[PDB]
Symmetry: D2
Subunit: 334 residues, 4 copies
Amino acid sequence: AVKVGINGFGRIGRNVFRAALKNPDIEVVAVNDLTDANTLAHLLKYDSVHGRLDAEVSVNGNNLVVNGKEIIVKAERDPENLAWGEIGVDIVVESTGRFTKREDAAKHLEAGAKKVIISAPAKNEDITIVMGVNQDKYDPKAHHVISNASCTTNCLAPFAKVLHEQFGIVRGMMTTVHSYTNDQRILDLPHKDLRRARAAAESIIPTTTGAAKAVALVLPELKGKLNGMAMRVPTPNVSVVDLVAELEKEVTVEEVNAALKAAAEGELKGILAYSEEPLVSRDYNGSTVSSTIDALSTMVIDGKMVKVVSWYDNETGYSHRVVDLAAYIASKGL
Amino acid sequence: AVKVGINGFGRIGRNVFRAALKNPDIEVVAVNDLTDANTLAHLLKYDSVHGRLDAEVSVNGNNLVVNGKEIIVKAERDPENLAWGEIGVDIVVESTGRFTKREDAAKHLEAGAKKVIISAPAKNEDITIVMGVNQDKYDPKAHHVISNASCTTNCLAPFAKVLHEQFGIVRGMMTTVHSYTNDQRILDLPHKDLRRARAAAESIIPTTTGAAKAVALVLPELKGKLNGMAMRVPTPNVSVVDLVAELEKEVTVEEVNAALKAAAEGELKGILAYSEEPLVSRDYNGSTVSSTIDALSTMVIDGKMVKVVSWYDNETGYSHRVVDLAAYIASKGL
Amino acid sequence: AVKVGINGFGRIGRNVFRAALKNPDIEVVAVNDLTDANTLAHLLKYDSVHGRLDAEVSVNGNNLVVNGKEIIVKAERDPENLAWGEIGVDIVVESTGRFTKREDAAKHLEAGAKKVIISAPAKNEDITIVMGVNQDKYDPKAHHVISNASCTTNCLAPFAKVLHEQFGIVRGMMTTVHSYTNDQRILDLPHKDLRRARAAAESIIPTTTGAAKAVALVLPELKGKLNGMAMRVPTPNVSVVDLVAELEKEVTVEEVNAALKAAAEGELKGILAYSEEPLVSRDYNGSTVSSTIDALSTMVIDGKMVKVVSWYDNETGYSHRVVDLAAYIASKGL
Amino acid sequence: AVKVGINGFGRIGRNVFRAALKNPDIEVVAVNDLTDANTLAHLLKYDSVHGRLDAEVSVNGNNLVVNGKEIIVKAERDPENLAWGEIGVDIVVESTGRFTKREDAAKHLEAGAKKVIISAPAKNEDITIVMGVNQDKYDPKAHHVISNASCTTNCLAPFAKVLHEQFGIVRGMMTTVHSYTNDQRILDLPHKDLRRARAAAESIIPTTTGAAKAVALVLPELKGKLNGMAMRVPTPNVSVVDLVAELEKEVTVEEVNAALKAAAEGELKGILAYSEEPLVSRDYNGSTVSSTIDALSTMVIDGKMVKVVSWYDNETGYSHRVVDLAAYIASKGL
Ligand SMILES: NC(=O)c1ccc[n+]([C@@H]2O[C@H](COP(=O)([O-])OP(=O)(O)OC[C@H]3O[C@@H](n4cnc5c(N)ncnc54)[C@H](O)[C@@H]3O)[C@@H](O)[C@H]2O)c1
Ligand SMILES: NC(=O)c1ccc[n+]([C@@H]2O[C@H](COP(=O)([O-])OP(=O)(O)OC[C@H]3O[C@@H](n4cnc5c(N)ncnc54)[C@H](O)[C@@H]3O)[C@@H](O)[C@H]2O)c1
Ligand SMILES: NC(=O)c1ccc[n+]([C@@H]2O[C@H](COP(=O)([O-])OP(=O)(O)OC[C@H]3O[C@@H](n4cnc5c(N)ncnc54)[C@H](O)[C@@H]3O)[C@@H](O)[C@H]2O)c1
Ligand SMILES: NC(=O)c1ccc[n+]([C@@H]2O[C@H](COP(=O)([O-])OP(=O)(O)OC[C@H]3O[C@@H](n4cnc5c(N)ncnc54)[C@H](O)[C@@H]3O)[C@@H](O)[C@H]2O)c1
């Protein structure tokens, strides 16, 4: 029903597409990138990480035909010339990675879109939402440039929430051991981040993350209580959050895991998951939840310091959240 | 001067051999493995991780010849049959990974050697030593079967000592993001550990570690204060320790780095190193120190919770400490 | 229908099992390995290359329970002790990699089975079959210990048959650029083959292959005309054959491609596939045919020399052919 | 001596820089890229493939200081603006990958340079040289825009030359199994070549090559007699050429190998090398020759069809040849 347009048909853009084909509440009517339709059809069809799209994809002139519906292909470098309004696009998913500051993202609104979901942390957005955490704070009257935060924040927030509500976080530090992404380099090339300049598939690469601090945007009570870093490693998809926290109450592993399982089975079902199996990163490829607790890794010291580890498919989970947010937003009235 | 034999000419035995080539004090005279001298000479010459050996290597009958010196090659499955005594070996480096219980390692003693250094965490050993942390605790009379601990423990202990001595650790949790080793599987094969059963180069693999508890063996005051986990990733060598600790003194990032830098330049010179460069794991390939603080990653929260990151070449640094321990033991009279 | 047993529940053993679940002609009633039922169920459930099995898998005592069918699990190191006969097993799939000589393989018949399929090149076998090439040569009275040849030979033979029949092969050389397998080493360890002793995921590793020579076992006319080598590379599955042959007739790329395409659509349907897409190795992960021509790579020089490239999922395509041969053999009378 | 400028301080640019450090005949006075001196200094110091540069490297304002030598750093996207002439640069190495067409490369001549070496196959150049094959054909008066061809052509031409001279090539097909380069993509992104669009470290990726054909530029007699393809694989550096050729005379494997070895030790010493060790790609990291025959891989069928395999460090060997050519051109007078 709600008409969606995707700006930047890359890892997240094409994964959102894939997640959207499942949602009957949403309809992707157009995509914009920097290439032609033949190239997009080919990239959409064959995915190195996710396998063949199971849908008939063809090219009809300048457009994509997927299961008989035509999808408009644009190739406009400048968001202002998109003309979203002319084709009836209501919600734009901004997934280029170039327009995360309000000045650029709002161009879509000026082009006739009713709402914009930035697929990353933003600057000056109306509101930053983590589904299952603070979607209730969205005001349809006032919020038009919406950030869906990062994949890492989507992983950490749901369980930080649980731990905080339940035991109370004094302070905590995280490490995300993260698959490489298109922001890195194949072989030692210039980068703003000198760590991210280095061959992506050959090293463990420390890099900064704003994800722990960003939790404070969706869970105000944690402002100034978490910090963290990332470690980019030689895998193409799937990541994991390692959080070490000092709690207010004294707990046991059993207690910590019970609260997490409860939430995964209740309030956070479909967002937070819980696993007691000894799995590895490849096992989570294709996982649509935001966070899956590795129960076997939970660990406590002195009743107060806990280690919690949670898996996330950084392309899939995050893309399903983008679609969830689009439906929720549309559900509040456009 | 002191003659050394190496049992198990694998990643550690060959790395120990390379390090011993630069040591004035010890001389490797014989090796034992399960293969022929021709295979061993090939493996010693050409290393996938460390490149070509810059030495002249040849085979003379059943022996390896390295820079004119003849090295005896044995192929004895049973340590008891080694006959270390006849060829004068006083110190045996136990690097097979099969004889880590004192009872098994003591077979070299039966075979004529005077001291045994097990290249891993041991069972019932006379003493566990971490060079620069507790070598002073070694008694030449009382201790014959000595464990050099694990690579991770050698990384963590030298800086856990500084932090504790300086600020006081209340409690702390570690994660080692570690390169794969020969204990893993190429493609999903039975293993006691169901996580290590999985394709080593394809996933992020959580696995347990006793390295954080094992710090208690060399710094008794940390007994029951640390715990940790490991994450094996798709790189062939070089690992990193990520420690999150609750300190007793309120600190700044600058004071933590200054204490670390101070120890690296002083007391722990050769063992602890300190780096302010934004490096990646490949830059640590060949590093001989046990631990190199990544000073740029140091972070504090609420003045009490710290994050310290330290690099280690799990093959080279650990091998260099094996040689250091061997010469320290020799220095104390054998 | 025909009851089957699997000896060696590894990459081929488990992939045959997966293939067999959707074949109504055969039924796997028992497997043999060197491990417990819990480890095998785990490995059957979660695969690093092929993902999660879509079947319900559990452990019932000492056995596996798959989709409500109890599967007997054995842990006999000696085939002669398998007692295949007492539980009605007619065909045994020999996939341990240890029993490729007819005399070793024949222990299975001593144990009560009626037929043995060795999942690799054999020694002294009754017959070597390549489905699609010479299965008509199977004789139910004279052949009991059958070899299904190698994955490489199953890729090459079907298209070498078309080129030969249509144009006539004078001579030709093959290279298989192949994924790594459990026969290789994680980090430089002794191996009979000094090339396979080297870190599997770190290099391009030239290795010998008998596959081009083995085509003569299924296509007698090609004896002495083909030879080749292999290059093992850092990918966990999927391989490709590059054949260069001197032909009898003058051809064009179009002629050669049309010939391959006709065979793929007619006689070799299901065994030989034909692709006009510019795909990469990951796109063929899960592919069930033995051979898929990369039509874009077909090249001719001087009307006489041709280059043909064909893809193959070395685990899946091969495993499906084992299943096809088991079904074929059962149709001929047991 | 000859003052050299480098345009595009990338994999080839910095490897040429490394190679030049050793040449007393050539002096690198300036480099141009698109970033600052601090970034370039860091990239030159720390290399993911070749390790730490053994030289003192610092930044002196806006310049690089290497072992006392100041190296001017420019950052001009447009070659027209480099003003080579003003700083005395005689030879320019064009290694950005963007200016291979004569009209773009000639811009360096208009900016004051005397000669331009394009580090890639070119369009409309004055001449294409393969050191040790046709450098004798270079005319100082007439040739000012010179291509040093590709890394593959440099591997192939030296031994195709020997083979043709000795036995005579009728026709041949080559496959180059090649390390990934910065021309590829980390995770499926638009690319002009839909093969090269796919995740580089995840697959075996077939791609066209003009290297076989380009041999005819340097060995005119082979025009129309060779063709080939490439396969990009998950390794960061080092490649291998696989040539299958129909010969004019009848040879033995022993004859072919002795011809290659004779050339490697005579004519082509330092360009063509010969190895009888069973080595792997990582063993050739840092290899400065153009082509190293893998003698154990030589194979003959019917005395007429030959397979010759040759290794090449695509970064280092090519880079030393760029330095070789520069020194050659200089010696003929500027
Ligand atoms: N990859 C992940 O795991 C991930 C997860 C969550 C959020 N994100 C965020 O999503 C964003 C996209 O990341 P990605 O990994 O998908 O990147 P990407 O490189 O795969 O895709 C970006 C796409 O945008 C296109 N593009 C670039 N500039 C354009 C322009 N001006 N107009 C139109 N198209 C343009 C590119 O051609 C490409 O197709 C970034 O903000 C990233 O931080 C990424
Ligand atoms: N790789 C590392 O980073 C590392 C670091 C520190 C300590 N360690 C420990 O060192 C030990 C060896 O580790 P590795 O990685 O060098 O292993 P590895 O597999 O590469 O080497 C073991 C070697 O021992 C030989 N061997 C096996 N059984 C033998 C026997 N009975 N007699 C003689 N030789 C025998 C094998 O042929 C092989 O060469 C293990 O205890 C491991 O925990 C490993
Ligand atoms: N992986 C491939 O691409 C492939 C393709 C075609 C043919 N093959 C052939 O198939 C055979 C198996 O290859 P793989 O890749 O599956 O190997 P693998 O190493 O993955 O599996 C071997 C299995 O046999 C079990 N095993 C070993 N010795 C045993 C014994 N004595 N009794 C019972 N079980 C035993 C092991 O525990 C393991 O599960 C080899 O002959 C191989 O050449 C392999
Ligand atoms: N990598 C190899 O093995 C290899 C080998 C032989 C030849 N080559 C050829 O050499 C060239 C360079 O290849 P590479 O692998 O080094 O690539 P690269 O991507 O590593 O480096 C190119 C460098 O050029 C700089 N650059 C880009 N545009 C520029 C501009 N307009 N002005 C100045 N600098 C600019 C980039 O920042 C980068 O540092 C290509 O033509 C390639 O085909 C590459």
